[PDB]
A paper describes a structure:
Cytochromes c′ occur in methanotrophic, denitrifying and photosynthetic bacteria and have proposed roles in protection against nitrosative stress, NO trafficking during denitrification or pathogen defence. All cytochromes c′ have a 4 α-helix bundle structure containing a heme centre with a solvent exposed proximal His ligand and a buried hydrophobic distal pocket with a non-coordinated residue (Leu or Phe, rarely Met or Tyr) in a position to exert steric influence on the binding of diatomic gases. Unusually, cytochromes c′ are able to utilize both heme faces (distal and proximal) as a means of discriminating NO from other diatomic gases. In order to understand the factors controlling distal versus proximal NO coordination, we have examined NO binding to AXCP variants in which the occluding distal residue Leu16 is replaced with residues that are smaller (Ala, Val), of comparable size (Ile) or larger (Phe).
The Fe–N–O angles for these are very similar (136° and 139°) and only one conformer of Ile16 is present. Ile16 undergoes a modest shift in position (∼0.9 Å) upon binding of NO while maintaining a similar rotamer. In this structure, the heme 7-propionate is not flipped to the proximal pocket (as observed in the 6c–CO complex of wt AXCP) but does have an altered conformation. For example, the L16V and [name] structures exhibit multiple Fe–N–O conformers, whereas there is no evidence for multiple sets of heme–NO RR bands in solution. 6on values for L16V (1.52 ± 0.03 × 106 M–1 s–1) and [name] (1.79 ± 0.15 × 106 M–1 s–1) are midway between those of L16A and wt AXCP, consistent with intermediate residue sizes and steric constraints.
Author numbering:
A (entry chain A), B (entry chain A): 1 to 126
The structure:
């Protein structure tokens, strides 16, 4: 859907900004510093679920740029494993949110965060 | 969810980038230049439906900036009407996509686009 590779970069960076905000805005809730409203979090995690699928389609062939390492492309199956682990952990976060349990939410949240970092460590430029 | 007003600006601009891409990427389909796959469009419009709700929460009090005119805040009920007309036209686009009819899709698409422009004409800086 991108006229030029720059447009894929812009898209993925914007998708990531959104995803990161819908993830990170729950940090005070999982830490107990903000109240836990099960319906509020369930709705937010449904947004996050949609957003979490969007970046990966904007690393198509030819869309090198931004802070993406070239190894994303050179090792496409390996990158896909990092993406899949992350998406599987989002499924578990959805489950915890749907169950309305803060202890399960905080565990699932931490698993997602670990998956974010693992992909960055391999595939995001310093 | 924003630490500083700048963060709301960044969020809304990213939300808009996404929304615009999921809207605009259908232009070749509504024009007939790309094939019409009803399932593909139904899925894309479901993404668009989620995205189309996101910008408006990031024009909260105190988040003046970017290319937002100050009248967004000064005339909050009026801005809300432009936002609601747009969101109602998204509901109609979802209906057309769910119905699998390209003639209804192209009409609903044009209605959404008109709603985008109407809000810009009043509330987006030149
Ligand atoms: C690989 C499978 C990744 C996973 C999982 C996550 N991120 Fe990511 N991130 C990745 C790349 C390759 C890049 C660079 C994209 C580019 O072209 O520039 C990024 C970048 C970020 C950024 C920078 C800001 C931005 O681009 O808007 C942030 C803040 C970021 N990533 C956050 C983030 C979070 C919170 C994640 C899990 C919820 C996450 N990323 C997962 C690769 C991958
Ligand atoms: C008001 C109810 C709006 C509707 C409906 C749409 N847009 Fe919008 N748009 C609006 C404002 C106030 C702004 C400026 C935001 C800021 O703080 O800078 C914008 C901006 C854009 C942009 C610029 C790029 C960006 O911010 O990423 C684009 C490309 C854009 N808008 C597109 C767009 C489309 C395609 C719309 C309907 C599908 C649409 N906008 C609706 C206000 C409003």
């Amino acid at each position: 859907q991108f006229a030029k590779p720059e447009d894929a970069v812009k898209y993925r960076q914007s998708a990531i900004t959104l995803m990161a905000s819908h993830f990170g805005r729950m940090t005070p809730v999982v830490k107990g510093q903000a109240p836990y409203d099960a319906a509020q979090i369930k709705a937010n995690v449904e947004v996050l679920k949609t957003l979490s699928a969007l970046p990966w389609a904007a690393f198509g062939p030819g869309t090198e740029g931004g802070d993406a390492r070239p190894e994303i492309w050179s090792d496409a199956a390996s990158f896909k494993q990092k993406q899949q682990a992350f998406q599987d952990n989002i499924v578990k976060l959805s489950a915890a949110a749907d169950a309305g349990d803060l202890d399960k939410l905080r565990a699932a949240f931490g698993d997602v965060g670990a998956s974010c970092k693992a992909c960055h460590d391999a595939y995001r430029k310093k």
